[PDB]
Design a protein around this ligand. Structure first.
Ligand code: 9EM
Length: 926
């Protein structure tokens, strides 16, 4: 039951075994131990209880020094119930941090040591040091840099002046100061005035019961809080927190012989014995084939097949680029006389992380080949890391041969740039071409006029890199010479060069260099794509990893979402290692945030266990019984402590304080998502814990709508959208924000009947408020009509459309996008009669209003077109995520067509109009 028998190992070699409760804190267990130890031999020899610390083997299989004795044995969760006393003394900082990391990332650091891979070890040393340094450096600076680091300003994208009554306050003081000020007032104006208002450049304003601070050179109206307060009517309640209170928070070449590879053996193969096994091999540079694909002989199907066969390639060693990858696929072929069975695949870098060409034997633990649309012999886009299941997985034994008495490395930049140095008819023939897939005759024209491309077409660098023959080192040196003198490209062009088709490390270096102009705000908008692109990297230490880490240590919000982006994929074998090494480095440099993410991951662990119970208890007792059988399981000391007082993983500046267990429920949906409510100690907020469904798809959809909202908001168009948070936290687990005062159009319609929504809106907006809500409906309708049409999100019914008490419409449960319904087809613009009605304020005909709504739809679509390449570039990088709905060229193509990307602005607007008008015509029929 509650109690558990614990083994205790005393430093005298004495052994005690007695029962204790699973909820007992370690401090309490130590006392029961000293009480029983006095009646066991060699007690006199022991030092005081406080002289010792408990040691245990945690879930992640490593020894853990259990320093915080306020932890319950249940929260410690040791492998077997074994505790060992050890002398406290040593570096009880690295011992403490290393342990917390292993728990937090859900992988023991020992797994990294076990590998005996220097690449892993060098990454760890360099990255942990860079981070540790940046953290130490962070600690040096004063309150202004720190408040900028931990609580970065949450501002509106960006106008009149208005009267604003603002309720000021002070630290500890329960005495308010309702002082009114100008909409365009700087922070000091709202500050020192209230300091002068109390008496008759120190401190900053803080939003009550939030980690949101008002500071810096900006007008009040430009701050999300003030801004939302103005719109929702409500008066902003600030607090003056002194500098003292903030500080308290603060504390050579030659080899002209061919490329040779010795396919020695295969291992643990699981194929039909009737068949024959073949190993197909190719050489690649990104997506491009570096030469013809050599194949092995057929050998009979067995577990350990032997080939001991030499494979030569139509590429001479000195021609192999830095990023050359050897790709393998094992096939089960029906011996020569209807489909060739793809067994497994494996990719390998021809050069190591230190520029040295790999020699000797290699045992490549292989990944299963997934049967798909692109049959493809090989998988060059696949990961270069070995299948971590070295245990039960198939493998291939290869041997790259020695080719010199001394090891050979790829040339240095100086020896590359050395070799690299050095008409009006064709000048037109370059303009016509540079105005995606260039034809081989056009390719050579671009390469010949490559200096003309650098001089007059710098934005066509991507086009130039793809025409380059990466299988001829002469051609590579030439390109690289121009690269090292190329003008800095805009963020938009740089985003394109992050994709798998640009594997050269010099390319990646240029791409990051141009991405260094990004404000924390715009960076946050691409963060998900940038994390995804790490899956296309060849080596652990790369420019993108370093960039992503620099940014995360410079901004806390970025660091937080970078943590969850990597954390939520710690289950995927392909990324576990890479992501794990980034998370350790991030943690080492963000020890403060480590404490927050620890609290969050803990509550998350409880919710998975709580949800798991409810899921089961649904297939037993009825819903109100389960509800009450959930409230007792929640009110357990440990459950309630873990679920209380934490920063929200969805928005770390939101303080989820006291759980309202009475208000906590679950949803009658498939995966039974938990409805968890909280109340404000100083400032309501709720979270939805869903486990079972993949949330990546929904987060990308929501991120894009938010991007659209920012792009629209930037050009003075506020379409009153609801960018509710959705965050994947783990394996088929995530959180979804609670939008209070909202209901699904199906539920609203069942409580005239054509006026069912208008009555609901009337019952939530009386008199003067009715006209406000319809403008909220009109504005949100347009935005979501345009959004869902552009993204190809179909199946838009009343169970997946929601209305807010303010009048704002918004979409939920985006199951599929890009025309997919399983089967991708062009989703038309959809005008719903029910909505068209509310827009017309109840009338049959009201073009006065309806045409204004037409304008919102039309300008929303027009703005999206202006940023069409952004969405294509972003979506093209998302192909690294491996979502079925976003796996190829035709998925990204959807966007080109939806946004009429090809067609002129006028040609696009007239087709949008035709589609709009027919959505209104077909609206009537439904
Ligand atoms: C108080 C209470 O116990 N309620 C009332 C809310 N409710 C309900 C109904 C219809 C839609 C949504 C719903 C779905 C989503 C939603 C948005 C995106 N995905 N989802 C569903 C998901 F959370 F499961 F993912 C959201 C949301 N973000 N905020 C508020 N309600 N809400 C909730 C309920 O079933 C119960 C559980 C009966």
């Amino acid at each position: 039951n509650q109690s558990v028998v614990v083994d205790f190992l005393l430093p005298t070699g004495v052994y005690l075994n007695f029962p204790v409760s699973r909820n007992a804190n370690l401090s309490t267990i130590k006392q029961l131990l000293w009480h029983r130890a006095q009646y066991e031999p060699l007690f006199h020899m022991l030092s005081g209880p406080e002289a010792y610390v408990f040691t245990c083997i945690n879930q992640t299989a490593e020894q853990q020094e259990l320093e915080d004795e306020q932890r319950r044995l249940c929260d410690v969760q040791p492998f077997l119930p074994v505790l060992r006393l050890v002398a406290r003394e040593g570096d009880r900082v690295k011992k403490l941090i290393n342990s917390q990391i292993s728990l937090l990332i859900g992988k023991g650091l020992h797994e990294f040591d076990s590998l005996c891979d220097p690449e892993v070890n060098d990454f760890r040393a360099k990255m942990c040091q860079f981070c540790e340094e940046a953290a130490a450096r962070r600690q040096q600076l004063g309150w202004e840099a720190w408040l900028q680091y931990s609580f970065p300003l949450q501002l509106e994208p960006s106008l009149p002046n208005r009267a604003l009554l603002v309720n000021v306050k002070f630290e500890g003081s329960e005495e308010s100061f309702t002082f009114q000020v100008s909409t365009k007032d700087v922070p000091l104006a709202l500050m020192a005035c209230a300091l002068r208002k109390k008496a008759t450049e120190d401190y900053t304003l803080q939003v009550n019961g939030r980690h949101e601070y008002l500071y810096g050179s900006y007008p009040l109206c430009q701050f999300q809080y003030i801004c939302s307060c103005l719109h929702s009517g409500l008066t902003p309640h600030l607090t003056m927190v002194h500098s003292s209170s903030i500080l308290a928070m603060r504390d050579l070449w030659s080899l002209e012989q061919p490329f040779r590879i010795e396919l020695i053996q295969g291992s643990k193969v699981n194929a039909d014995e009737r068949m024959k096994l073949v190993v197909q091999a190719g050489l690649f540079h990104g997506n491009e084939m570096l030469c013809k694909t050599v194949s092995s002989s057929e050998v009979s199907v067995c577990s350990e097949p032997v080939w001991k066969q030499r494979l030569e390639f139509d590429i001479n060693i000195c021609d192999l680029p830095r990023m050359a990858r050897l790709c393998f696929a094992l096939y089960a072929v029906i011996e020569k006389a209807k489909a060739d069975c793809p067994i497994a695949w494996a990719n390998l870098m021809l050069f190591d992380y230190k520029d040295q060409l790999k020699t000797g034997e290699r045992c490549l633990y292989m990944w299963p080949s997934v049967p798909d649309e692109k049959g493809e012999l090989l998988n060059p886009t696949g990961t270069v890391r070995s299948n971590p299941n070295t245990d039960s997985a198939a493998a291939l034994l290869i041997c790259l041969p020695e080719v010199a008495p001394h090891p050979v490395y790829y040339p240095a930049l100086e020896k590359i740039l050395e070799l690299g140095r050095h008409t009006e008819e064709e000048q037109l023939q370059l303009r016509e071409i540079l105005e995606g897939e260039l034809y081989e005759h056009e390719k050579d024209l671009v390469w010949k006029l490559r200096h003309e491309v650098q001089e007059h077409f710098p934005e066509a660098l991507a086009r130039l890199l793809l025409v380059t023959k990466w299988n001829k080192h002469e051609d590579v040196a030439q390109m690289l010479y121009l690269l090292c003198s190329w003008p800095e490209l805009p963020v938009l062009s740089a985003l394109e060069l992050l994709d798998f088709s640009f594997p050269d490390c010099h390319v990646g270096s240029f791409a990051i260099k141009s991405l260094r102009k990004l404000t924390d705000d715009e960076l946050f908008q691409y963060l998900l794509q940038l994390v995804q692109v790490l899956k296309y990297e060849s080596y652990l230490d790369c420019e993108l990893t370093k960039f992503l880490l620099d940014r995360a240590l410079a901004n806390r919000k970025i660091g937080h979402f970078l943590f969850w982006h990597l954390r939520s994929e710690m289950h995927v074998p392909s990324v576990a290692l890479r992501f794990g090494l980034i998370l350790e480095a991030y943690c080492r440099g963000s020890t403060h945030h480590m404490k927050v993410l620890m609290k969050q991951g803990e509550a998350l662990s409880k919710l998975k266990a709580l949800n798991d119970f409810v899921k089961l208890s649904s297939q037993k007792t009825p819903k109100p019984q389960t509800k009450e059988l959930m409230h007792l399981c929640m009110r357990q000391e440990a459950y309630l402590e873990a679920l209380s007082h934490l920063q929200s993983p969805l928005d770390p500046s939101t303080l989820l304080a006291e759980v309202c267990v009475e208000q906590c429920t679950f949803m009658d949906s498939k995966m039974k998502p938990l409805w968890i409510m909280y109340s404000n100690e100083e400032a309501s907020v709720g979270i939805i814990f869903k486990n079972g469904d993949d949330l990546r798809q929904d987060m990308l959809t929501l991120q894009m709508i938010q991007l659209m909202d920012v792009l629209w908001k930037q050009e003075g168009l506020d379409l009153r959208m609801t960018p509710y948070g959705c965050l994947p936290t783990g394996d088929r687990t995530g959180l979804i924000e609670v939008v209070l005062r909202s209901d699904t159009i199906a539920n609203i319609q069942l409580n005239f009947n054509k006026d069912a929504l208008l009555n609901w809106l009337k019952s939530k907006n009386p008199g003067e408020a009715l006209d406000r809500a319809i403008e909220e409906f009109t504005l949100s309708c347009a935005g979501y009509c345009v959004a869902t049409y552009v993204l190809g999100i179909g199946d838009r019914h009343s169970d997946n459309i929601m209305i807010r008490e303010s009048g704002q419409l918004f979409h939920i449960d985006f199951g599929h996008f890009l025309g997919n319904f399983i089967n991708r087809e062009r989703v038309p613009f959809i005008l719903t009669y029910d909505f068209v009605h509310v827009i017309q304020q109840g009338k049959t005909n009201n073009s006065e209003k309806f045409e204004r709504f037409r304008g919102y739809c039309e300008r929303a679509y027009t703005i999206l077109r202006r940023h069409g390449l952004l969405f294509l570039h972003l979506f093209a990088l998302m192909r690294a995520a491996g979502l079925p709905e976003l796996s190829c060229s035709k998925d990204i193509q959807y966007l080109k067509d939806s946004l009429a990307l090809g067609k002129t602005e006028e040609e696009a607007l007239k087709h949008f109009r035709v589609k709009f008008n027919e959505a209104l015509r077909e609206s009537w029929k439904t």
